[PDB]
């Protein structure tokens, strides 16, 4: 899927996310639960309130994985093996929910990186996050 300007562009942009990935991450979580609440279904054990420290907890996890992936663009199926299992196998996440995370994450990025969120950069991040997601449901495919 990923062309080398995609690899380039992704790395570059992730470089600008910086160590905000954690928070960008648990903010992309907030937005999803508000704007697509179908999704909370999957976090019954969680306090979903309006700055839950689990969600906190969680988005650092998610921002962390994302960051790992960036690392392993060339070998994503490997990098996310353990985690393709967790979402595909154990939890059985309807894949359509990746598409909404994805977006809530593009949306977070744009709020905060508005200068940087160029179209170019917008579309790479889209493939990236789409490639990421296929890996995260390949354990269905």
């Amino acid at each position: 899927v990923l062309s080398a300007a995609d690899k380039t562009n992704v790395k570059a942009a992730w470089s600008k996310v910086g160590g905000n990935a954690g928070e960008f991450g648990a903010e992309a979580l907030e937005r999803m639960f508000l704007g697509f609440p179908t999704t909370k279904t999957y976090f019954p054990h969680f306090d979903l309130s309006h700055g839950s420290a689990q969600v906190k907890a969680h988005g650092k996890k998610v921002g962390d994985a994302l960051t790992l992936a960036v690392g392993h663009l060339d070998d994503l199926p490997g990098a996310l093996s353990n985690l393709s299992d967790l979402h595909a196998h154990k939890l059985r996440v309807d894949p359509v929910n990746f598409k909404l995370l994805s977006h809530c994450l593009l949306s977070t990025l744009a709020v905060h990186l508005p200068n940087d969120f160029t179209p170019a950069v917008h579309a790479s991040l889209d493939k990236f996050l789409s490639s990421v997601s296929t890996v995260l449901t390949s354990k269905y495919r």
């Binding site: 907030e30 704007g35 949306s107 709020v111 969120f117």
Partner: protein, 146 residues
């Protein structure tokens, strides 16, 4: 649709600050950039080959107004989403043959634009609202499909 009545006032009061021409154009520019298959339907606008060519393109801008501008109406018209687009749901099915999963695609990039432009004023809750609205519209636009 419905939403809610705080949901309603906050939507409107935003729209108020929305520049239809800037925002319509960038909404459409990304659409074709990010989902390049969309370009089939706009070949008439000539050269779209790279992102700069695209954003610059003047017809692109035009036409993004137009759409932002219809979206506009639906925001103002939330009781009667189908009634409004029927002549354009008509447009879009018969003559152009556009898959509806595109109107939804568009609805999102719109939103992401609005996001970029309003920064932290774009709230979670406020996002939601628009996700409905945009949804609402994307729908009205597939009904009088048949």
């Amino acid at each position: 649709v419905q939403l809610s009545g705080e949901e309603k006032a906050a939507v409107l009061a935003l729209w108020d600050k929305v520049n239809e021409e800037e925002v319509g154009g960038e909404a459409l520019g990304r659409l074709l950039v990010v989902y390049p298959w969309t370009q089939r339907f706009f070949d008439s606008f000539g050269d779209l080959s790279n992102p700069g060519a695209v954003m610059g393109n003047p017809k692109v801008k035009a036409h993004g107004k137009k759409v932002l501008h219809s979206f506009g109406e639906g925001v103002h018209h939330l009781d009667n989403l189908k009634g409004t687009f029927a002549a354009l749901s008509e447009l879009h099915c018969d003559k152009l043959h556009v898959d509806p999963e595109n109107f939804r695609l568009l609805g999102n990039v719109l939103v992401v634009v609005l996001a970029r432009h309003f920064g932290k004023d774009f709230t979670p809750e406020l996002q939601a609202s628009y996700q409905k609205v945009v949804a609402g519209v994307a729908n009205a636009l597939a009904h009088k499909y048949h």
